[PDB]
Design an enzyme around this catalytic site. Structure first.
Site, short mmCIF file in Angstrom:
data_model
loop_
_atom_site.label_atom_id
_atom_site.label_comp_id
_atom_site.label_asym_id
_atom_site.label_seq_id
_atom_site.Cartn_x
_atom_site.Cartn_y
_atom_site.Cartn_z
N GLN B 16 4.11 -1.33 -0.70
CA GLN B 16 4.84 -2.10 0.31
C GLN B 16 4.24 -2.36 1.71
O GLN B 16 4.17 -3.52 2.14
CB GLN B 16 6.25 -1.50 0.46
N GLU B 139 7.23 6.02 1.83
CA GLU B 139 8.28 5.60 2.75
C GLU B 139 9.06 6.70 3.50
O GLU B 139 8.88 6.88 4.70
CB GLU B 139 9.26 4.71 1.97
N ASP B 168 7.47 1.79 5.46
CA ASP B 168 6.62 0.78 4.84
C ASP B 168 6.48 -0.56 5.56
O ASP B 168 5.51 -0.77 6.30
CB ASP B 168 7.07 0.57 3.40
N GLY B 259 20.61 3.11 21.17
CA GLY B 259 19.96 2.24 22.13
C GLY B 259 20.86 1.25 22.85
O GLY B 259 20.38 0.35 23.55
N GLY B 260 22.16 1.40 22.68
CA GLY B 260 23.09 0.50 23.33
C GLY B 260 24.29 1.27 23.85
O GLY B 260 24.31 2.50 23.81
C1 LIG Z 1 0.34 5.17 -3.12
C2 LIG Z 1 -0.17 6.40 -2.33
C3 LIG Z 1 0.93 6.83 -1.33
C4 LIG Z 1 -0.60 7.51 -3.32
O1 LIG Z 1 -1.46 6.68 -4.08
P1 LIG Z 1 -2.18 7.05 -5.30
O2 LIG Z 1 -1.35 6.87 -6.50
O3 LIG Z 1 -2.66 8.43 -5.12
O4 LIG Z 1 -3.36 6.00 -5.30
P2 LIG Z 1 -4.60 5.78 -4.29
O5 LIG Z 1 -4.38 4.58 -3.52
O6 LIG Z 1 -4.73 6.95 -3.36
O7 LIG Z 1 -5.86 5.62 -5.27
C5 LIG Z 1 -6.34 6.61 -6.17
C6 LIG Z 1 -7.83 6.31 -6.40
O8 LIG Z 1 -7.97 5.05 -7.14
C7 LIG Z 1 -8.88 4.20 -6.48
N1 LIG Z 1 -8.71 2.76 -6.71
C8 LIG Z 1 -7.78 1.92 -6.19
N2 LIG Z 1 -7.90 0.67 -6.58
C9 LIG Z 1 -8.96 0.68 -7.41
C10 LIG Z 1 -9.59 -0.37 -8.14
N3 LIG Z 1 -9.19 -1.61 -8.13
N4 LIG Z 1 -10.69 -0.03 -8.91
C11 LIG Z 1 -11.13 1.30 -8.94
N5 LIG Z 1 -10.58 2.31 -8.27
C12 LIG Z 1 -9.50 1.95 -7.52
C13 LIG Z 1 -8.71 4.57 -5.03
O9 LIG Z 1 -9.77 4.06 -4.21
C14 LIG Z 1 -8.66 6.09 -5.14
O10 LIG Z 1 -9.96 6.64 -5.23
P3 LIG Z 1 -10.37 8.09 -4.78
O11 LIG Z 1 -9.59 9.04 -5.78
O12 LIG Z 1 -11.83 8.11 -4.85
O13 LIG Z 1 -9.85 8.31 -3.40
C15 LIG Z 1 -1.53 6.01 -1.54
O14 LIG Z 1 -1.94 4.64 -1.63
C16 LIG Z 1 -1.48 6.35 -0.01
O15 LIG Z 1 -1.37 7.63 0.39
N6 LIG Z 1 -1.47 5.23 0.65
C17 LIG Z 1 -1.29 5.00 2.13
C18 LIG Z 1 0.20 5.01 1.96
C19 LIG Z 1 1.05 3.93 2.48
O16 LIG Z 1 0.61 2.94 3.10
N7 LIG Z 1 2.31 4.13 2.10
C20 LIG Z 1 3.33 3.10 2.41
C21 LIG Z 1 3.52 2.54 1.00
S1 LIG Z 1 3.98 0.85 1.05
#
Ligand SMILES: CC(C)(COP(=O)(O)OP(=O)(O)OC[C@H]1O[C@@H](n2cnc3c(N)ncnc32)[C@H](O)[C@@H]1OP(=O)(O)O)[C@@H](O)C(=O)NCCC(=O)NCCS
Ligand SMILES: CC(C)(COP(=O)(O)OP(=O)(O)OC[C@H]1O[C@@H](n2cnc3c(N)ncnc32)[C@H](O)[C@@H]1OP(=O)(O)O)[C@@H](O)C(=O)NCCC(=O)NCCS
Lengths: 427, 427
Positions: B16, B139, B168, B259-260
């Site tokens: 998100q 989130e 998010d 806030g109000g």
């Molecule tokens: C979703 C989340 C919370 C946990 O995610 P997750 O399921 O562990 O997935 P990740 O995004 O961390 O990716 C796992 C691995 O796959 C890899 N990967 C992702 N897309 C890929 C692709 N197209 N091809 C190959 N590898 C890929 C990642 O680079 C990562 O590699 P690493 O193990 O070397 O670090 C994570 O994305 C995160 O902590 N994100 C920031 C959170 C955020 O913005 N949250 C608000 C959500 S809207």
């Protein structure tokens, strides 16, 4: 150096929405001149003051990096002064009301005629063309109109407002995107534009995820990740069972995951005493095995009744209930660490007290100590966006009319000219 | 004209936060290319689908105005394309866990080298340098870390998460502010920057008012507008009064104003069966009289112990209890109109059901009907900012890899070579 250096902003805003917007712009290097009411000033100055006659924390925390000037706009000379200022401004921001600015005679049409390059930005309660295109709106009312209240809280409770400023600061940040969007456009047309953000709309944007749920509910009749999907778990204040057989509008799901994976707020050691002794524990589908290891439930790894989201739907709340059992003798942080070893998304509920004196946030510049020799230093929230080649320099909020003279001069006027305005009280 | 027309966005975001940001950029004209994992793509595609084998509403409501390309980035040829692509992009957006992009070999440093004008924007759970720098965050975990949870809900209940996406989409919109700011900088330095937004910081920024209260509490030991401030109104576990005695961290204040100006969530006809049959009645000061006019109660206007903020902070909850009685036989709207006369800040709790199909919101383009000939139409939230010389055109979400070839050709690859990338399984 700074994103908005050289951008002159005429700030007619008050309270939170608008002020938050212009303050952030100011943090990015913009030159913000706050036009306040002679004698009174932004109503936040005397709102919940911690010390008599000293501008309140409500005002200082929303008006840093700004200069103040007192000007009576229901005055002929006051309206002329604006023209001298509008001609120098890059963007004008205001709340006031649906047509408060219009009644003052400064309409979009007249403004373009004064400065073809200026951008007019506004925050409204409802979008222009909305049935409530006329209503005055405060924080909580916006939360109610946008769907946040209806979807926040518990099924056996009332709609709940959020502590976060969903209607005010949120609207402000949204207005900022509009203004910058306008600025990027101007580069391509050398022509300004009018931008507006309705508080109801800013709230609805953050509630997008729930509009997703309303449609899922209309199409399938159920929201599997909600507590109510579990047979006989939720009841109303009179003991009647709550299920999706009778739910036609997105219900309140307590502390369910929302846009994240399934989760719940779990009590930690001392919850009876410390109101914030809790952690948010998530049960991500891709992580059942780890959870099973952490809670010593190996028998649950291969059980079809537990190893899939669909299988957990009818007992999810019982599982959280059991997990919570393992945190009885540990605090937020111990539990958070313990979970971290397994890579499970778990975080403690941070109290304001903890957030205010947290080393990390001060180190990265999110919680900043503002040097205010006049009112005394105070904490504030800095820029939530960090840049590789830019550091915000936050300075104290202005005193009422502190720069009225300083400004009138910059316009071109002179000592004698000024003095007259002070007398006539146009300043 | 379209604010971001011509801006090329390399989108690696999923879920998100990041997607909301790029979708909105696209709504503003940006050319967004969504790079997704092969065969599976963005995990939102198969997240709570309403129809089997059809991208879910979670995905379609956050990925309109985008093109899709599959790419195995853990591949040598996959990495060559990204590098080649970064050369054609103005900004790259990402939100993979901490250090994921770096391990793929695409750190800020290498990225600048590949293209000095490209802006790197990312969303993370915590700011770089924070003690929880490397934690994965969803989130509600961010709502807890940023202080929203601790300050939302009731005193006799647990920390409560907001239905609004404080963690998010709120971070997504903040990241958009950062990106537009970086684009305003590049227009001067002629080079891109790295911009990041931490979900914790995004949340903290909307909880600014609570950092205000925490300091007020430390400095004065009391919060006059909070429910606990009234003579034994709220109670703890055991049947006993609450007060700012022993309360050192901003507490949960149920449905207080925040806030109000003060206010409460009052019940309306059918609240027993209609979870959203409530209105929010704000008792401001500059119209205390009017309130006394509707509530047909003039004995207050002339009662000092009533017509002032200070002369009422001891019986606030008593008035609310009162007023609610008068709403007993009316619906949200009837109560809102019967009040609107006195220009009073009263608003109904809008349900998702009512908002999803409100004719007004669709006219102003806040709730938009997306024409999706592949999946069937669905509703979405449009642009919260309205522009005088620009109207967004929302387009349906892309199928997984629907534009792979189309994009691999925009780069320069030939009809044959593309067939090889498919064979080698990089695409
Ligand atoms: C979703 C989340 C919370 C946990 O995610 P997750 O399921 O562990 O997935 P990740 O995004 O961390 O990716 C796992 C691995 O796959 C890899 N990967 C992702 N897309 C890929 C692709 N197209 N091809 C190959 N590898 C890929 C990642 O680079 C990562 O590699 P690493 O193990 O070397 O670090 C994570 O994305 C995160 O902590 N994100 C920031 C959170 C955020 O913005 N949250 C608000 C959500 S809207
Ligand atoms: C605060 C609010 C909610 C109700 O405000 P209010 O107390 O009624 O005050 P207003 O801003 O509407 O102003 C009242 C009048 O004083 C006028 N005024 C304001 N500043 C003035 C000045 N410096 N000199 C002369 N007149 C001035 C206004 O133009 C308005 O004139 P009008 O009656 O001809 O319309 C209102 O600002 C509003 O509805 N604002 C948009 C709301 C918003 O952004 N809310 C989020 C808040 S953070």
């Amino acid at each position: 150096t700074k994103p908005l250096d050289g951008i002159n902003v005429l700030d007619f805003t008050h309270v939170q929405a608008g002020p938050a917007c212009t303050q952030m712009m100011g943090f990015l290097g913009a030159n913000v001149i706050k036009i306040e009411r002679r004698g009174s000033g932004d109503m936040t100055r005397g709102w919940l003051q911690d010390k008599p006659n000293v501008d309140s924390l409500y005002f200082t925390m929303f008006n840093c990096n700004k200069r103040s000037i007192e000007l009576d706009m229901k005055t002929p000379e006051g309206k002329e002064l604006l023209e001298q200022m509008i001609k120098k401004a890059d963007v004008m921001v205001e709340n006031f009301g649906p047509g408060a600015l219009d009644r003052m005679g400064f309409t979009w049409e007249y403004i373009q005629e004064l400065n073809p390059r200026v951008i007019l930005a506004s925050v409204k309660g409802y979008a222009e063309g909305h049935a409530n295109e006329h209503l005055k709106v405060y924080e909580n009312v916006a939360q109610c109109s946008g769907g946040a209240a209806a979807t926040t809280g518990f099924w056996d409770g009332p709609p709940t407002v959020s502590g976060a400023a969903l209607g005010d600061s949120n609207s402000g940040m949204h207005l900022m995107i509009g203004i910058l969007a306008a600025l990027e456009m101007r580069h391509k047309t050398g022509r300004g534009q009018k931008v507006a953000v309705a508080m109801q709309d800013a709230v609805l944007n953050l509630v997008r995820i729930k509009l997703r749920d309303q449609q899922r509910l209309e199409r399938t009749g159920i929201l599997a990740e909600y507590p109510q999907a579990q047979p006989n778990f939720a009841f109303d204040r009179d003991g009647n069972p709550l299920s999706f057989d009778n739910i036609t509008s997105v219900p309140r799901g307590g502390n369910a995951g929302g846009g994240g994976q399934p989760g719940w707020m779990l009590k930690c050691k001392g919850w009876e005493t410390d109101a914030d002794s809790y952690v948010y524990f998530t049960i991500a589908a891709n992580m059942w095995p780890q959870i099973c290891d952490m809670i010593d439930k190996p028998e649950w790894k291969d059980d079809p009744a537990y190893n899939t989201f669909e299988g957990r739907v009818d007992k999810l709340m019982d599982i959280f209930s059991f997990i919570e059992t393992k945190f009885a003798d540990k605090d937020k942080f111990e539990v958070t660490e313990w979970a971290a070893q397994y890579g499970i998304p778990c975080g403690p509920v941070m109290s304001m007290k903890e957030l205010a004196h947290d080393p990390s946030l001060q180190k990265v510049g999110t919680v900043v100590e503002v040097v205010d020799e006049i009112r005394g230093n105070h904490l504030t929230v800095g820029a939530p966006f960090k840049f590789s080649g830019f550091q915000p320099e936050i300075t104290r909020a202005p005193l009422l009319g502190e720069h009225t003279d300083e400004v009138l001069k910059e316009l071109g006027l002179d000592d004698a000219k000024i003095k007259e305005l002070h007398a006539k009280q146009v300043v």
